């Protein structure tokens, strides 16, 4: 499931880190956060690359296992090769039972076939954004935020305030007094 | 004078009519500034000191000539050239000009049911225009030059125009 294995990294630097990717086939990583000193760990590339095609990979909670001591983490940021695209570095944020945390949550758009602006007016659908910054307690962190586009007419805009959210979830950008277009309907290009 | 009228009845009645908690925050009027923008005399320069005398007798106080802050050839003017004159009044001298303005001159202008009660900036100040200078006494109609539009501004210590207008309801301003 959401299981990752790690070993304690000891050699730090550019030359040491370039050697892991070339010979050992491992990936440097960091486990910071919580109330502890940060820990530098390493993990195998073919295992992190297999957890990353799960759709709810970043918005779920991982069970990291460093050596024989396991704990609760979350994919906080990720580094990829600009050209090839594989992952080079990754950092994990520790999860505390009573502490607010932030995450990136993808949006599950639904029932676009029977939208009023598409079935009747013959318009298109454009997803302006595909994830939203959220902030919530770990116990109620959603896998996806569901946006419903059934009763949408041609030219009608959908903003952050339009979509619903589960309990105890803030949209961060909305809290900053900045709601922005999520999706819209418009006439065909040609 | 109007000094006696403000600090014995006008101020105490406004104290409860705005429901103000403190005495010092009761609104008051500080200064009256008149000027007149002489868009003429761009090539004349003779009427500048003529309009000085006109505004000198109206107030009993010498005016000062205000200069152009920028050239802008659209009005055919240039920096350092005189555009207008101005006066500023305070304390007793503006409670005696007001009384003459209140009713010796405002009734005899030509017309009007009242004054526009909507000429208030967002901060509680009132400014009114005057079309003909002859509305005042102390200037004979038979001796003046061409008519010119004196101007009036009332600067008050009002937070907003609600108590600013309320203060001008006192002194029984002619508001239509």
């Amino acid at each position: 499931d959401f299981i990752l294995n790690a070993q304690v990294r000891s050699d730090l630097g550019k030359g040491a880190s370039r050697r892991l990717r070339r010979n050992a086939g491992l990936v440097p990583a960091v486990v910071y956060g919580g109330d502890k000193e940060p820990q530098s760990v390493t993990l195998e590339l073919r295992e992190i690359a297999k957890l990353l095609e799960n759709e709810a990979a970043f918005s779920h909670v991982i069970a990291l296992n460093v050596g024989g001591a396991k704990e609760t983490v979350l994919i906080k940021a990720l580094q990829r090769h600009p050209a090839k695209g594989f992952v080079m570095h990754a950092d994990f944020l520790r999860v505390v039972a009573d502490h607010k945390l932030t995450a990136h949550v993808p949006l599950h758009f639904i029932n676009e076939e029977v939208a009023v602006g598409v079935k009747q007016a013959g318009g298109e659908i454009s997803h302006t954004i595909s994830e939203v910054e959220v902030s919530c307690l770990p116990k109620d962190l959603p896998e996806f935020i569901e946006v419903d586009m059934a009763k949408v007419e041609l030219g009608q805009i959908v903003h952050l305030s339009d979509l619903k959210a589960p309990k105890g979830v803030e949209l961060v950008q909305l809290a900053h007094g900045n709601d922005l277009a999520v999706a819209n309907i418009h006439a065909s290009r040609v | 004078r109007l000094k006696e009228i403000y600090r014995k009845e006008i101020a105490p009645k406004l104290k409860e009519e705005l429901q103000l908690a403190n005495v010092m925050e009761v609104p008051r009027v500080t200064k009256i500034t008149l000027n007149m923008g002489l868009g003429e005399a761009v090539g004349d320069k003779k009427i500048i000191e003529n309009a000085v005398a006109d505004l000198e007798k109206i107030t009993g106080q010498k005016p000062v000539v205000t200069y152009a802050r920028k050239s802008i050839a659209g009005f055919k003017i240039r920096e350092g050239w005189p555009i207008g004159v101005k006066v500023t009044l305070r304390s007793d001298r503006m409670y005696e000009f007001l009384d003459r303005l209140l009713s010796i001159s405002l009734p005899r202008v030509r017309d009007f049911r009242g004054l526009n009660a909507k000429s208030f900036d967002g901060r509680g100040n009132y400014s009114m225009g005057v079309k003909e200078q002859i509305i005042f006494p102390e200037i004979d109609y038979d001796k003046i030059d061409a008519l010119r539009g004196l101007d009036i501004t009332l600067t008050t210590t009002a937070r907003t125009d609600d108590e600013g207008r309320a203060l001008l309801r006192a002194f029984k301003f002619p508001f239509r």
Partner: protein
């Protein structure tokens, strides 16, 4: 107030047609006879 650069300022009088006498210091040095004032102007009365 500076010295001797301003016109004379005296109390004088002001008498209106409606039997109104008002004291007001101004620069005429002579009593005046008026024709209108608030005690007699139409729009100051209700018309």
């Amino acid at each position: 107030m500076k010295a001797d650069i301003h016109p004379t300022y005296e109390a004088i009088e002001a008498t209106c047609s409606c039997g109104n006498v008002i004291k007001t210091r101004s620069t005429l040095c002579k009593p005046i006879h008026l024709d209108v004032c608030s005690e007699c102007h139409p729009f100051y009365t209700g018309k």
